[model samples]
Target chain A: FVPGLDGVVAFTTEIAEPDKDGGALRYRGVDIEDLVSQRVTFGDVWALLVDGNFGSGLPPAEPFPLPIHSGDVRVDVQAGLAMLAPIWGYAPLLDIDDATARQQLARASVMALSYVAQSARGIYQPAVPQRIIDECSTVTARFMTRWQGEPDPRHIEAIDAYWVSAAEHGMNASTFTARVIASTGADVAAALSGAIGAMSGPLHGGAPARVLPMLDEVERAGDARSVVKGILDRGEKLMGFGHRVYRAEDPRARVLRAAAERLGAPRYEVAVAVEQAALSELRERRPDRAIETNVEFWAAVVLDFARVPANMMPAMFTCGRTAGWCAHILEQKRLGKLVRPSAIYVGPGPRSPESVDGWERVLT
Target chain B: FVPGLDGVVAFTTEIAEPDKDGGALRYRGVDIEDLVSQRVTFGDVWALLVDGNFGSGLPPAEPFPLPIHSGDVRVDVQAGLAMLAPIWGYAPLLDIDDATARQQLARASVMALSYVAQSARGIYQPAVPQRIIDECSTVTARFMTRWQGEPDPRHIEAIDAYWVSAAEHGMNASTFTARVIASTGADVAAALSGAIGAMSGPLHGGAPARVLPMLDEVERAGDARSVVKGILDRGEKLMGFGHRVYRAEDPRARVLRAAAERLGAPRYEVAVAVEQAALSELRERRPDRAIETNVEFWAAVVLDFARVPANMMPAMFTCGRTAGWCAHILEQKRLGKLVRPSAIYVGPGPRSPESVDGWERVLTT
Candidate 1:
């Protein structure tokens, strides 16, 4: 009945809420500003998102063990790491078995990370949780150390903040895709994989990676104001400026802007100039539209600061968002119904072969 | 706000319509019963579903080429086929660039078949459309030959019917998922692969495979009547009897029933007797419920006759439905708006860390 189901309240959630009016966000009733200011690790934020509390009175500051990849017991994990090199190679082979939903989700989250790592870098490090637990202090540190050798505190802090910021948003396209799959009583792998596929769309998770190129184009021109004005004059979308939900400046952008500032990278300087010029130009061009900087704007800067490749940004977002997806999947399963919607038949309605010319009855 | 979006007309489609009141179904506005009765090939039905007409100047009976696996240019297809040995492996790696939506869908359809063939029988057939075009008359025939050596005419006829019947249905879960992804301006591979994942759910494309076990249970019980009675008495759902869309008999069930009878397999006999007992018991138990035989009931019989394994049914259905998914994806792309919906927040209202119990302020200075 609704085109794109826009403004339709699809479901209820206890997860994060993007307060467009207030220009703030909350994950499980905890304000994002508080979390960011408090300087929690990505692992701690993940714990709060999934468990609604920091892990069982365990030291919230201490990183939880990294998910391990045992080359011996888990043959499937090894095969999956290999298969994911060809893209969705791990999807059909993903086992959606009798494991608890969250357990399967945990495995899928690690597998997704490994898949991206294998695709981006030619290294196949199986996510061995036990080994990671023994070797590392936090999941964020482990990821950084695995991707690039021994992590720097600045990079770790940036990644930790980036992952937590990316952790959850309410009923995003991919999360909705996950909930739809879970509504069918499908396993967590099915839901997570489907969500990843949905995120591949440029409108959703794919947008952040495109921002880096736009920034580079501006940097090359050496005149941020004129370059941004020319981009607007040419009738092109300034990739990371506006958002569908946020009416004001996006809260995640606010968080990442600080992260970008802390890194003190040259790209951050370029990004800030572009932001000011683009905002001024956007307001001049369209007075009515509330075009403001979104999360992707500064997310590009932070990801670049952390040395994550532009192409790998979507996968990095997936590593954190998988927690939110699994949480939504569990909630959908509790509701226990299939997400089947109907369609209006706007096509040629009810016709017979004899009714139309040139439409011969050639069936026999 | 609608749960499962039931009764919410999400989008518009010209592909297929299930006439719940009339108990009729149509593809491209032509009655399915009309097409089936006239002995249309699945290829002809697919042409209608996808292109809205049969190919230029060719007789509709002539099967279009099974998409070729071009080893020379399409290295992705080869890699995709090899990856699909696990299941849905082509999904994550499916390229969403440059290729037209339908072209990507054709690649995905072949990859889905390869995924199943590799999983079902340890043989990996890269979807070389040209090689398959040279080898077979139709896609169904090509699938049959590759999976199980040369197909019988009767079996092919049964499969042909099954594929056409399964080809298109109104905005079901997987199809809706495809449209949702497509609405985001994503490529056909993204839409189709996402749809496949959604279909893996038990309530959608996964339901047909489940009917096989229920049939086995009935046969093993030896008394179809008491078996039906016991299943109902135990408050267990009898699979494949009721449908969400149809209030009367499912038209596809009627067509497949005839296919089952024509095949004359032993399972057909068991299915019919079981159908009779279950319908009688269902009416008696509910009194007012229209719990009639649906498509999956007799589809299991026909597929069994065609030698489709129970576990592989979903993949088989995927092969037929990919055409429909591509068609819907193209339609959604034409609309060109992101399908993002909002959610009602029912959790505790926005709170500071100091407000909640046991939620200590861990963000220390």
Candidate 2:
């Protein structure tokens, strides 16, 4: 039996894959670095990667009325997927008329996260932001605008880079969860909901939020080397120094690192010092493994520079990865089969129970 | 890359497996035939398979108030799994105090299906079933009582056999879906909810409901041979005849056939004649294949005799298999790892795109 099915290939994908040499991450053959350098919004990357349309502009968005407001957007996302399945049948938002649902299901992740982000920031009954028809056309801009009243173009570009780079990464745990459920020929909502559950696992929740504290401690101590050594002295991991798939520095980390650099905030300078110090310490301590900066490290710096609370980092992850999930779900529908694996039985052999109606007093 | 992952062993299980020599299905190493002959309820088998507790009695039951009811229980179950994730958390019903939740989740599949079964039968605003302490302790008895004013003992035994026999199978699609979700360290609700989606697929929804129409046509013609020939002539499948995994008559089919025998209903007699005629015709037509009567055939007859509507048959499959989903979910959590299988990249290689702000007419877009 394969322990984790670690190398077992579930299916071949034409959508996204990390480079074998590990310096580049590509979506549908276009490098993310190219996308980031070209200054494309997430909407452009999504249209290209998911629908294979270069000129296809952004789709309209509208909010869904989810009444089960438990003050947590993830919980709300879970309910919205199930409760809205009837409305969002098999209609891909781009394939259908906007009046039917207004691409509500397609844009649900960002909307739910933005609502809780505002509500937590002392906005009770948060006023639905004024209708910005054709304004803030990109999902990243709308999310930033909704959560922070109005967003700077620099911050918008930074978060947009995160979304596009993270928009697709070949079958990770959460993406696999989406593929398995979608393989059942269930609705896209079911696939997305299942993926959300999988992503909620601590193993998959990409610890960008944890990276915030590390950077904060480094800034306060003013001695990056001391803070790096102090963290390793304890039994704690230095957050976001390594990645599972990349051998060299993560490409998205490079993209977001540049994003942080472009912000040119004072905190960015502190992050630069902390990153350099952490790199030297990790290289000295664990010389065997390829311990390099990952997406989470720079993702924390960029989002912090954008004035987003650290608590919302994971929700931001959901927003960024939602498009990748959409592409995978659409791709799985083409396979038209189920994902039924067998199991080896090491169970008990034949055994007998008591005769029929044992202890007859309980028979109804 | 293995297509459909048909023969890949996901993991070893102390839970259950189909007999390799055929003719028996075992759960926790105990043949289901033994459980059937011994008249054990689904609850008892659930305790054995899920918790490994042989003498553990039934857990209590109370319904959660689901505010969204779409007249479709499957949709509600999807919502129920997500909407109640807050209350259910990671605390499994049996592991915690009974009064804390009253086995609401352990029994949710049955409870949700029962509500819709009654509501579809024109019982709108269906009365919440009265509490039945130690009485109606088995899930089969409770579901039957809730749906059909009161259930016959024979019907209960038949359904309990279906549930117990179906309580655990090897890593089938739905069970594997539960394992994949649970492997993520998510709570049980997430696992079960994901499983419900997998089962809703047409390929996995066992076709007992289709068998009822076949039986009715056979009974109406008073000649099973003609009906079988006509069905094959029309390019239609004779439902409940062949199984993907069984080369012999399905063991569950054997159990449920006897379950129908105990009732001796007219419909059961029609089903018996139909099974024999279909068997002869199948053997004659497909000399190379081992086509045999499967569980769905007799399941249709047995559940029809139990007064369950044909439409509710698929939901009943969900109810019976919920225990298996639970055991698989719990078993998966013990492994403490994720099911992150790799994918092959077959896409285009690196390419170029337009420069920044090509269409400044709409910079935001």
Candidate 3:
């Protein structure tokens, strides 16, 4: 019995994998470092991850508009933007029409994140011109510029690198969640939506933004050593360190650290000190475990330098990872089998209630 | 090497299961047959499935309203109903606030389906009255009445039974999908949405609606034997006759068969003939395989009697199965572990790009 499916090879994939020899991350057999350093746009990487080759070009710069009708009344595009707001209890009921439209699905996933980021910042506005939306070459650059105005070249490059690195990781929770949904023959929208939901959880895609708060605590403590020791003394989990899949330093963390160092924000200094002190303290406490810095550690620094709000970090991750989710969903669909796994029955054995008594009696 | 995760015990659950001796279905240790025979309301069964015990008398009859604000504009509940319509390229970006609000999630799931059904039927209206929505005791009855305007009492009972039977099954694809999403610590909305997506697949929740069309084709051909043989000869699958897990008969199919017979819809006759011919032909063709009639066969008959549109059958299944999804989500959260599984890497080993020339050159041949 594989609890939490640890170390179980449930399926096979050619999409992406962390080098088992513990080196670097790869997307579609190409090392992520190669992709990022080569200055591949997120759209280009997205094409490679999903289509297994760079598409004709970057996805049409034009925003694929979502069908703006809910019920009988047609909502304007601006109003329709709110349908995807970060508000609770609001999700557009998607149909087969929405699920099958590839262009709209791609455009809507990116735009949805853009809408959430803008709304969280209290700058929700009418739809940006389709030309301006189109002119931005990459989804990363487009959403960043639209959210924070036209960004500096360095900021654009950092965003591009971050997105390319974040685009796909093999069999991670959110991506696996997407594949499972896709294995059922669901549409890309359904699978992607499920993935976004999984990503929202703190255990998975939710960790990037959490690194900032750990850094904040460290800064408040005024000494990285004490803060790191105290956190260990309290037996709290050290965020932004250690991963289930990687033993060596996370390759994505390596890429983001370079980007973070180049950006050279004040937070990078605090982050570096915390990482150093935490690794020291962690080694002293548990010398045997291979606890090392993860991508979230430097991801916080770079995203901070990019001026993205901490709360919006997960949304940013979602924006880039949606491509990977779509890619995995398509792959799972091609396999054409349902991913239905059995469970060992550990609950009560077969039995029947004795009476139609009250709830209390039924429970007893 | 475990293709499709077949026979791999991924986790453990006490929620519901087929009897070990394969005699009956049980929820929280009580026989589903007992519950259905006792005429338990779907709400009561829902409470049992999610909470492990029935709550007070039953679920509140009032419809819970979903928050309708998007981009600072508050859409009317009526307008909000279409937010869940199965139109292309639309999804609500939900938040933690929506996830934690239990009442809203329950109400919104039901309302979302109601909205989908109404929108499909071209009768989009204002927020359904909380009173009228609540007045119907079971999810099956409420949705049936709302969709077809006060369905017959017998029809409502049949729907109620079908729903109670369909509400939960052990670790099915959609339920497992919900649990996987929940294991990531996502809220019920995310889990349910994922389950819905998984359900939309033709291999999983997409099966029930297809059963009706197969029956229609059999009826048109006027000979179940010829139709069954023709489908097999053409290498087309017979949809409603077999299941992945069941060896003898699906207990749910047994219950639904009773329900279908009592309802006595003309389609029930057509379904029965198809099931018999298909099973007989299937056995004669492959004596070694254990194939039997499954729940969708009779689920189609009962749902048709309840006047649910064939296309809307999946949505209807969602309405009932939301309880099971929530149950699994809550169960997964209680375990509080991420459901990350590894894959056997069979792709090209890591390599470096030479240069950015063109897409064609990038493709390694």
How well does each candidate superpose onto the true structure, as a TM-score?
0.84, 0.87, 0.83
Best by DockQ: 2
Worst 10 contiguous positions by lDDT, candidate 1 chain A: A70-79
Ranking by DockQ: 2, 1, 3
Cα shift from native, residue B328, model 1 (Å): 1.0
lDDT tens digits by residue: candidate 3, A195-223: 66667565675357367767888778778
Residues B1-365, candidate 3: write the lDDT tens digits: 75688667778887887663575778888788777777777777776776666663334434434434332111222234324323322232233332343443455556655554444434344544545655765565666555566568888888788888888887778888888877776545556666766665666842574676678788788898898888889998887776444556777888888778766666778888888998999988988887877677778788878776775677667767777776777677667677877786686775655532355533220
Q: List the residue pairs that clash in candidate 2.
A: A348-B29
* Model 3's DockQ score: 0.42
- Chain A TM-scores of each predicted structure, in the order given, are 0.79, 0.88, 0.79
Model 1 per-residue lDDT tens digits across residues A1-364: 4577787767877777777777788988888877776677666676577666664321211222222222211112222322332232222212333235544455456555544443444336443343443365666766666556555668877877888788888877888888887776654655665676567666765346367767888778888888887777788888677644466777788888987787676688888888898888888877887778878777778888888887667667877786687678767766777887778776777887555343574435
- Stretches off by above 4 angstroms in model 2 are A56-58, A88-123, A127-135, A145-152, A205-209, A264-266, A355-364, B91-123, B129-135, B147-155, B205-209, B307-311, B354-365
Deviation from native of the Cα of residue A1 in model 3, angstroms: 4.5
Per-model tally of clashing residue pairs: 25, 1, 12
On TM-score, the leading prediction is 2
